[PDB]
Design an enzyme around this catalytic site. Structure first.
Site, PDB file in Angstrom:
ATOM      1  N   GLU A 181      -4.164   0.269  -5.131  1.00 21.95           N
ATOM      2  CA  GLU A 181      -3.373  -0.956  -5.202  1.00 21.95           C
ATOM      3  C   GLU A 181      -3.259  -1.367  -6.660  1.00 21.95           C
ATOM      4  OE1 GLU A 181      -5.262  -4.049  -2.851  1.00 21.95           O
ATOM      5  OE2 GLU A 181      -4.767  -3.200  -0.912  1.00 21.95           O
TER       6      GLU A 181
ATOM      7  N   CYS B 234       0.838  -1.164   0.000  1.00 23.42           N
ATOM      8  CA  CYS B 234       0.000   0.000   0.000  1.00 23.42           C
ATOM      9  C   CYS B 234       0.880   1.221   0.000  1.00 23.42           C
ATOM     10  CB  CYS B 234      -0.917  -0.071   1.189  1.00 23.42           C
ATOM     11  SG  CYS B 234      -1.384  -1.788   1.352  1.00 23.42           S
TER      12      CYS B 234
END
Length: 227
Positions: free
Chosen positions: A104, A1
DNA sequence: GTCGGA
């Protein structure tokens, strides 16, 4: 992330927390305006010190002097409380990073397609962070990390890890200085937002390049293309 | 003393 959006005013995010908090942070009603928040920049980070909330610009990344590799940006929740490296951050350096959602990149081989991930209920998110205190000192290498967790339910199809996202009530508990590391672990285990409360969609390739900016970066694109 | 695109 390793990328997210933080575009609204600080008061928009603080409004989701207990009522006597938006007043602790001085008034600055400028939209933060960041649709492409990247590691190694300063990011506004919420924490508690001397029994008061503070919002400080803190370097996203962690690299002490004895760490001669590039800065880390994430800390695994499973082991951060017991890690020789992260244990002091878990104990005294807990903080919250608010966001509209995070990006993502789903992979096929090494080819990638970005997705933006957000609360289906339209609310912002409070991501759990740990970092080097005192946060206000503007350190250029020892800042904060976003805590990660195992991806669950449908998020597994995008990536096997996710940021630890806390409910507003849990986020407030997480920041308290007077709780033990064990209590923090129990907050992380009890206050995490489950995957079924998020939605996601593919976005344009443009966001991968930190140079690119603006609200279009979180807008859906029609075609999924791994490139 | 550990975990992201370009």
């Amino acid at each position: 992330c390793g990328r997210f959006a933080q575009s609204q005013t600080r008061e928009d995010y603080l409004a989701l927390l207990a009522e006597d908090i938006e007043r602790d942070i001085p008034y600055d009603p400028e939209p933060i305006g960041r649709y492409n928040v990247a590691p190694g920049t300063k990011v506004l980070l919420l924490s508690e010190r001397d029994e008061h909330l503070h919002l400080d610009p803190v370097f996203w990344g962690y690299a002490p002097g004895w760490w001669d590799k590039p800065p880390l940006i994430n800390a695994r929740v499973e082991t951060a409380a017991t890690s020789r490296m992260f244990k002091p951050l878990w104990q005294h350096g807990r903080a919250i990073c608010f966001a509209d959602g995070w990006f993502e990149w789903k992979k096929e081989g090494d080819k990638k397609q970005p997705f933006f991930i957000y609360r289906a209920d339209g609310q912002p998110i409070f991501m759990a962070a740990i970092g080097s205190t005192p946060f206000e000192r503007g350190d250029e290498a020892e800042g904060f990390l976003i805590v990660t967790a195992a991806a669950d339910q449908g998020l597994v199809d995008i990536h096997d890890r996710r940021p630890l996202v806390l409910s507003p009530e849990a986020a407030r508990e997480w920041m308290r200085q007077e709780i033990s590391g064990k209590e923090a672990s129990e907050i992380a285990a009890s206050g995490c937002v489950p995957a079924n409360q998020f939605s996601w969609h593919p976005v344009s390739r443009a966001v991968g390049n930190v140079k690119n900016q603006g609200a279009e970066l979180i807008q859906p694109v029609l075609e999924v293309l791994f490139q």
